[PDB]
From Swiss-Prot, chain A:
It catalyses: Couples ATP hydrolysis with the unwinding of duplex DNA by translocating in the 3'-5' direction; ATP + H2O = ADP + phosphate + H(+). The chain holds residues 101 to 766 of 843 of the full protein. The gene is SSL2. This is General transcription and DNA repair factor IIH helicase/translocase subunit XPB/SSL2. Belongs to the helicase family. RAD25/XPB subfamily. Changing E357Q: Loss of DNA translocase function of TFHII.
Amino acid sequence: PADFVPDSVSGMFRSHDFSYLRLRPDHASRPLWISPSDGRIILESFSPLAEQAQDFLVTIAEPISRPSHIHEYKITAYSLYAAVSVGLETDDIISVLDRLSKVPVAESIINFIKGATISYGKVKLVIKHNRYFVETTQADILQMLLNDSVIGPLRIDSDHQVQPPEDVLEREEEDDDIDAVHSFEIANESVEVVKKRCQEIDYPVLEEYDFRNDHRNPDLDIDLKPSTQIRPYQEKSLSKMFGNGRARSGIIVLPCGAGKTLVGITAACTIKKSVIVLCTSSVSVMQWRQQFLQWCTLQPENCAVFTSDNKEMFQTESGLVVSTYSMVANTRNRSHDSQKVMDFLTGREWGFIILDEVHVVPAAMFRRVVSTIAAHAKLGLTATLVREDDKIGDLNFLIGPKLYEANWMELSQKGHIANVQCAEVWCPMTAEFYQEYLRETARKRMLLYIMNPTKFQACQFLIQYHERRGDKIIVFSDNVYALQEYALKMGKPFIYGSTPQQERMNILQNFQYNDQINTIFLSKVGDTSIDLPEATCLIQISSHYGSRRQEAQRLGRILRAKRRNDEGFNAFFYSLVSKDTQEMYYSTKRQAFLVDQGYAFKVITHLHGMENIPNLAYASPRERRELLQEVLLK
Amino acid sequence: IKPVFERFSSVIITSGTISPLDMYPRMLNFKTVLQKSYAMTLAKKSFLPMIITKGSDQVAISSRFEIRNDPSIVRNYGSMLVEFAKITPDGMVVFFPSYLYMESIVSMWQT
Amino acid sequence: KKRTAKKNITPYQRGIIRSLILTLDCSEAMLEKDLRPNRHAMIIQYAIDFVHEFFDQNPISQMGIIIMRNGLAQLVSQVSGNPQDHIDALKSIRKQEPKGNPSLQNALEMARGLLLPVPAHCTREVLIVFGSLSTTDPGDIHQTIDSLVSEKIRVKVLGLSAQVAICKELCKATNYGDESFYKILLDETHLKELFNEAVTPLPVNKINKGFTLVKMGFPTRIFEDTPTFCSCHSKLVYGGYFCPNCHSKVCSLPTVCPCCDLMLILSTHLARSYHHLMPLKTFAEVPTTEKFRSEDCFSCQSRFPXXXXXXXXXXXXXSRYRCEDCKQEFCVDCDVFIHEILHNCPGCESK
Ligand SMILES: [Zn+2]
Ligand SMILES: [Zn+2]
Ligand SMILES: [Zn+2]
Ligand SMILES: [Zn+2]
């Protein structure tokens, strides 16, 4: 009942029968070729409507491929909710393109399309006093509201509220379902139980986000200044969630590493009212607020961070909150500096909530944060579209409708991440590495094949290449000694596991401000959670990387955005994986999911000067034997 | 206007702007003979009336909000304007609601 | 539903012996992604085509190239009768990239003095490829406009999908005050035809001017190969020609002699103008029913002409393009290709 039932409609209806089935006669006068029983849409060069089609099909369905002649199609039942977020004339999509589609459309898919598009969309959600209220899109909503018990626990019997409807809206119901019905006021704590039943009772509803109902009458001043940054794909995908001027809190799976904070500081300061920013852990969020926000508009002195151990400005922060999921709602709130924050978070209005890769954490801690605070808007900058808080009542529909998904080629190619490059360098193995492959039989060799120095040699060119090409380098290597075993090799101010900050602050003031230093790195501590810096060249090494949800998080995140079109590949990527290994399957599975979502994946095992670069430290296979007495001990 | 109304009967008033042609008879308290508007007999567009309520931000943009600057509206206007300078040929004019309002937007756009 | 000129007022003086130095823009404007590579690279692709064709349709003319970069104009090719020097120049220019802004007046005067050595018979003309919306002029352009018109040099230019009034005025000003020379593009094929119509000479109505006779001789080919020796380039030539007057061993070239400086031409260039000089009237598409002529093409054998009362298929049209002078038909494919390539109306040729 509480399992994620409605989320996974995408990729369905892939079947057909040659001998038994029949064919739509319209193929001859059929510019397009869409298969509903097969789930794909082959709109090749003969299908010229890809402009509207890509506009409509991307919303309605999933892109199977991106062929030059024409892209491919995926049966997006989830795109049905995505198309549900569009709301255009339904017949035109089925009909206007239907002329191009020579074969007939899928009937069971159409029945599923009816179920997917508007079928799971009309249960009940009334609007009360500039927010959601006690009503329904259908009288069953009111009748179910009449039967509402968990929903009924925290509602004002008045049809709506002015201050309560502003504040209580028993929490923010600004994401309520089909309105224009009599309501009843909603109190100021706990819509969790309101949405508790909807998980188990499955209220299939047509919702929206009444953005201006996030009035948040007291405007807690922010700094809406151009100190923060932005690149064009944001002001498209943001404009997707911004809507027409009136910024709507929508659902945006935002990779941290796509100008994620850039989205917020635009958006948050745009609200110019009391905002809550939130990352994972008190130790983790510290890095998060640090390394972007001050070149950006934010000053640390006001974005207060609590732990119940870090007594900070709660009830006194002249500025908004950047917060830690660990601090906010978890058992280890074993003191009070965190406690009064919620009392203050109840005490103070909050117009914006920022969520970062919360797919890491169960909603048990998360929905705890949302059960009293009584905010006005939230924002889940999701990491992987499949997560552990996206149950039948998904997080994809508590903030607002879908507005951003795995399509960077249309979006990111706006100069924001234009000319997106993904490459999987297949480093040939050597005797000792394969003798190590021969040696042991466990996942500890993950440490004994990540250790490739030719991978450093290839990356060392990328250093010198982007030393000269003027591209920003990111190296994803959670290793520590091997990093230092290579940080000595590569030779730049090194970021290492458990680095004190100011050196990295020097290293990143050598990244945002200086150029004599031309390389940086990421460990299992910076990520997470450092605001990923400027990116035109990415190196990734780990490929087992539990989980794939973390990997699907890892995909868009380790490669940050770049307001760049000058570089022929304004975001280089390099998956330095020694070929003929265990993670070869993992990197190739990554490589598929590299090419699955549109990220322009490639493979270059013949590097431009792989060995021609200097400082080939430890190059000889006997050298590769000399130090191998160390790595096996891991 | 009453004495000039009084002195003569044959009087001609015309405009390409007057709309509606009924306020003025109400305003100046007189009876005309023909209250008719002429339309441009053009087989070609020759002018594109454009109502930019929504900018690139798709923000409902206005001058009624204040006589002051708000970069959300203003910088949007400034960003909106510049693209014309590239595409438009010689000849392009703006018309502020107020000269003081004109100067208000000038300095920060200069900034 | 036909897009044809009502009549062709060719019949007399046109621009035959030409001295054109087309000027390009090499600026950030040409860098932008208006065309698939960009303006410039596709234009360089486009520009390359006309060169040989210009020398093909008008081998009796001379041509150099000038560009405009970073608010300054730069000549990039010498006025010559050989495409290759011009052709090879663009290859570097292809690998070169446009930069900065164009300087119109720099091109105005650099080309202006460039055409000074041109003889009267060689007709001076300039064409412009412009992408920006403003110029870079070290001085009064109207003075230069005055200077050019005083030099009696009509000019056609083609800007991008826009209009510049002074450029509209300039093409007007250059061309006797007649403005028919600031045509601009809206499509690449619509741009391609601009090349296609450019190769044509330019008759409108030439004022009664001093008309000069011309004396020259034909060249005589050299036969020996082992005797390789050249004079116009001081090289060894495994085969050449001989001047009618200076009698110099000259490589294959329809250009002027290098010793006594006289034009060397055999026959080919001459008759190129002739069909240009006196072209034909378009083969009139004879009616579907009012013609009732032979159900076949005349130049070719296209037995199908309509569809014979086939609802709308026959009511569509009748591929019966008939030359009026010969009173003989022609299939559209034949007739268009005839007027396209070889005037030579066989019905008019047969008499
Ligand atoms: Zn020679
Ligand atoms: Zn001679
Ligand atoms: Zn024929
Ligand atoms: Zn004829």
